[PDB]
């Protein structure tokens, strides 16, 4: 089914939450003898008409998507009265690759991360294609399908380019994933495919620290930035990416992913690597192992 009938949809639990949006596990049955198939359902939570129309875009997008790297969109619930609309997507039990790499870290070589990060370099590659911006690039909105196999798995945050332009100014309530953006996404609010190349490094430094929490994204640059009175958080970190500072190659991480990850970093977005660039090279170290 495309249209799922609210009271069908069984709650289970919670599978996760961010920006406005929180994702439930539930089973769809139809015929309430709990026979139905396990399906992820997205909705809204202290959410008004400014971010009921951007959920419904939401919607839209990942309705139009069609990547073998890309969360499955399977149709809309409309609650009672048609004022609480939610989005229906392909369940995926192994979760999100963050949890899935904070779990086992040991059973995980540098092909195995390297190969999810081609797959999430070919989604990549295919949203560029479709003009779509994601703007929350990250290990925790990345799904495990499989043991060899990942999807780009939430949209709350992305953008269609327009079509006069290749980058979107986008000033919007929220918290931002500052230590994922790039530096004209922290100061001019400017999204592009370039600036999404920019936290795909982030997520490159992600992998191959397994997501430890000691060093993350946050942690990492939250130690350089320091504490300065009358200097924003915002301001210090802008100023150590401009004076050069990066987050460090990860204990062990092979020699050419921190390359790529540099690269990736490039001050200016011109001078960042595409993905359709990145791809044959990921594919190659991953070919390497
Ligand atoms: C991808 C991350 C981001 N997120 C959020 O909930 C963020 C918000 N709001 C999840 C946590 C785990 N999620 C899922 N887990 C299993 N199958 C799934 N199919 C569709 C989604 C989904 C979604």
Known sequence: ???????????????????????????????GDNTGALVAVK???????????????????????????????????????????????????????????????????????????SQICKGMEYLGSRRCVHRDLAARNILVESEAHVKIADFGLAKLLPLDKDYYVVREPGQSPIFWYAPESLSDNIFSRQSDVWSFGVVLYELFTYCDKSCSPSAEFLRMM????????????????????????????????????????????????????????????????
């Not at 495309?2 to 961010?18: A, C, N």
């Not at 309705?63 to 609309?85: C, E, M, N, T, W």
């Not at 990860?250 to 993905?275: G, I, N, T």
Request: hydrophobic share 35%; glycine share 8%.
């Open 43 to 117: 909705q809204l939570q202290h959410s008004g008409p400014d971010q009921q129309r951007d959920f419904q875009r939401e919607i839209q997008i990942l309705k139009a998507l069609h990547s073998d790297f890309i969360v499955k969109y399977r149709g809309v619930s409309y609650g009672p009265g048609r004022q609480s609309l939610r989005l229906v997507m392909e369940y995926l039990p192994s979760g999100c690759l963050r949890d899935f790499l904070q779990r086992h870290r040991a059973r995980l070589d540098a092909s195995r991360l390297l190969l999810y990060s």
């Open 1 to 31: 089914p495309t249209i799922f009938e609210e009271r069908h949809l069984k709650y289970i639990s919670q599978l996760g939450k961010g920006n406005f949006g929180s994702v439930e596990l539930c089973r769809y049955d139809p015929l």
């Open 226 to 289: 320091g504490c300065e009175r009358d200097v924003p958080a915002l301001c210090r970190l802008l100023e150590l990416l401009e004076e050069g500072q990066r987050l460090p190659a990860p204990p062990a991480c092979p020699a050419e992913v921190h390359e790529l990850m540099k690269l990736c970093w490039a001050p200016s977005p011109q001078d960042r690597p595409s993905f359709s660039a990145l791809g044959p090279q990921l594919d190659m170290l991953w070919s390497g192992s």
